[PDB]
Structures are given as C-alpha cells and as structure tokens.
Amino acid sequence: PAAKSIVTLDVKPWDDETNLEEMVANVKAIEMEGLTWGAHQFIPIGFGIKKLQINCVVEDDKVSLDDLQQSIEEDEDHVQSTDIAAMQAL
Amino acid sequence: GKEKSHINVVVIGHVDSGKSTTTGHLIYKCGGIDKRTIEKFEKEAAELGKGSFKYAWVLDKLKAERERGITIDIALWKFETPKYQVTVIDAPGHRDFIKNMITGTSQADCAILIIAGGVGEFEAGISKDGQTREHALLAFTLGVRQLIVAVNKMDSVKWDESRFQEIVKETSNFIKKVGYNPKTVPFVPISGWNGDNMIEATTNAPWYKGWEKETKAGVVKGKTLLEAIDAIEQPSRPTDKPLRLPLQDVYKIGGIGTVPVGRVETGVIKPGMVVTFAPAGVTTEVKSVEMHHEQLEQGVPGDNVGFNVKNVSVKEIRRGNVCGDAKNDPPKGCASFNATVIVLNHPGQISAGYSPVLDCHTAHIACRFDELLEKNDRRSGKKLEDHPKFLKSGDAALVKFVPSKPMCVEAFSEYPPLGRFAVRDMRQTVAVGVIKSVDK
C-alpha cells in the first residue's frame, strides 16, 4: 500500500451570491490519479457568507496539494482562494 | 466534566514507528471523531468471535473507511485529558505538509516522537536523512520546546529492560543533536497496539518504574503516555499582546460593505476599535465581528472571524495584508528584514541574489536574499563567519531580505505567527526562517 494523507480544504467564494452547489461540483469534477474526494459541507463564516469545506484523500507521491489548490482556484467565477483547513496521515 | 485549556500537539516518527496507531488510539479512547463509523465496526466485530475486539481492529477498519471517502468529520482531530483539550496532528508524510507546519494554523506546544523498539526498525527511523529528523528539526527551529518520546512496539522486544535503556540513550543522543535536552524529555515505553502505558499502566514490565522529567519547578513523573500529555506545561497566550490579524479573504456584501476575514494570531478584535491595514495604511472603525454563526463581542487569539468596516474599498486591502490596532503598535510595511535561515536537504546551493517565494502567514511574496550576513552554529547561535559566500543543506545563517512587493512581517520574538516563514522552490520547501529584525 502507498502512503496517503487525508486533507480538508477551505474553498472561499466571492460573495453571498456565489452559487455554492456550482463551486463544489467544479471542484469534484477535478480528476487526479491518487486523489479521492470525500464528504463536504457549506459552513457559515459570517455575514451570510458560506465557505466550502471538503475532504479528500491523496497519495503523497502522486498528488500535489499545491497544484490542486491552483487547479481549484482556476474557477475565477466562483472561487476566491483556497486554504488547508487541516491534514493528517493515514 | 471540567473546563480545559487548549494545546496543540504534533506526532512525528518513521513510517512504521506505529504513530498512526498510537495517535488513533488516543483520539479513539479520549475523543469523539467519526464515532459513527466507530460504532459501526464495534458492533460488526461480533463476527470475529463472541464479541470481544481489540481497539486497533476498529481503528484499522476506520482507516479503510476513510480511504473510501465516506466518513463525515474532517481532518481537525481533538481529544481530552484530565486537564487539556488537545488538537493533535499525526504528522503527514506528504511533502506539502512542511509549509503547512510553518505557515499553518496553530503551532504545536509539544511534539511527541514515536519510536519503534524493533532492532532494524529503530536504526532506520533515526537516519540523518529521514523525514522524522526533519520534522524534529523544524519543530525545534520553530520554537517547540517541549517533547515526549514514546518507544513503541515494546511487545516485539518482549519488554526487555536492557533494550529499552539502549533505545533511550541512542534516542537521547539523536534529539540532543537536534537541540533538545534529554533531561527534560519523558521516555515512555508503550504499545500502541496492546495499549500498554497508553491510558493505563502496563503489567508486562515489572522493572518499569515510570518516566520522569526535570522542569523549572522540579521533577515530574508518570507511567502512561496520557499522563505525559497531561504534564505538558501551560503555554503563554498572547491575549494581552497588540492585535495582529493577517487577512485571508476580503468580501463586499450589499447593505453591509467591505468584510475581510482572517485569524487573530495575537491580541483581541472588538467592535468600536480603530484598526489599520498594513502595508497599505488604511484606517477604519470595526463596525462588528462575526465568527461562524454569531456575533461576537470580541475575537480572541485563534479565532477566524469576519469583520465589517466602512470607507474602505475592497480594492485597497487584500489577502496577505495585516490588520491591527491603529493605537497600539500598529502594523506596518518594511523596506527589509533580517532572519535566521535553516537550509534543509535539497539539490542546490544558495547565494546572494537568490529570490524565491516566501510564505509568511497569509503572505505569498518573492523576497531577495540581498545579503548573507553571517553563518552561525545552529544550536548556540554563535557566529562562525562573516559574509559567507553561500549556504548549503544543514547550514544556519543570518540573511537580510528585501520583499519585491509591499509586505508586512514581525520579529519572531514579538509576534511568532508572523516571524516564521517558508522558502518555496524546487517544488518543495528548501528553507525555513525566523525573523530577527525588521526595518519598519
């Protein structure tokens, strides 16, 4: 078995109008060998603004978290930025 | 139960030291993460026999479950002790975790080094080029002064005292070389799998009289790993320190206005205050503060809150900007800043003019290694030479930096969260620095 790490990302929108269902769909549409999307929720952060909090499991020697964050962020119309909420080993 | 103070812990060790099992065991028996999946496998374990089951079995199934990606809870893991609410991190092997261990949220107050008692295993774990030593080195450089050592798999060695002692001496040498003082480190013999000395004292080693450690007020002793965690010394919270809130995002809500978001590293944010956004110099009043669902009358260190302000366009302030009290050491940009850099293992040699990207808190800017001030002895800080011509893996030196874009940073000594940075290059972290002086 290969070494893995479970990661939770924080995907922020542009405002309180950004289609949240569209954001996660585009995120989940991202396919990478060694990447597995998991649970996800919309968490309020203040002023009616909700962020995307999704989990995923990745294979260290295959998936790059940096490149992944860059890929997600290409969704200019929905994504403002990304951050690592937390991460652990497996 | 009772009220508890917060503390962060990071568990490091070789890939087979059994640290995921040790860590998993604590969260399991002392916390509440993914309990649903747990209750699913505890009832299913009735198959294995008549009902009995090893905790490690359930943990094993939970791992496979997460790999499928059907678990609920996220990566933020916590667990309690007779005194502490602990947010733990089972140090990941993934290389992108390095930056996160330096610029991420909540720096550990103590690191637990898990070591396999196995013959060949032990040696392989303490390699000078292993990831374990790198995590230890980073923890040390970043200021994690407390440490716990756990010699796991004591069962595989039949709990032989002599083997335990040799392990302790070699491990003490190993950590000493990193910069840790062994006399302050509790060496706990356990078995992540069988649970010996995890939460209850073992009965497989009559010779074992418990661990102990010297502290500023005397010597503290114990038997279990849990006790060692509970013995972690209370860290100093920068509540009374000036406000520092690095910005993560900025919004514009109709009928509300501009609302930046970020984490309060130090100080307190309240409505009514007059803050300043560095390095821009924007000053405004804090209309209010929200976090999660409610309103907050104030945000303390560690909170990721959102606040509203008027007369400030969202095109004036941005991610990476620092917020603080306009009338209490307020945030400012810098012409440059001097830092202590620790070059990690990597295919290269650094020299003046090198201008990599540096990740300092929420800031992501390329800075120039303008001058190589001096090379120094890592552990003592003593100067070895003036103006070295280059630096290589393992080297520790004082470097003068010059940010290419407007940037705000702090001296680690005053604002830890903004005085430690990661140097990005070669698809990895080639270096870690600590700010020693800033030219504001």
Ligand SMILES: Nc1nc2c(ncn2[C@@H]2O[C@H](COP(=O)(O)OP(=O)(O)O)[C@@H](O)[C@H]2O)c(=O)[nH]1
């Ligand atoms: N004999 C023995 N084996 C253990 C113990 N704890 C864990 N193991 C085994 O050692 C291996 C490595 O453990 P693991 O948690 O995956 O290590 P990590 O990847 O470094 O976190 C696994 O096959 C475990 O079942 C222990 O106390 N005694």
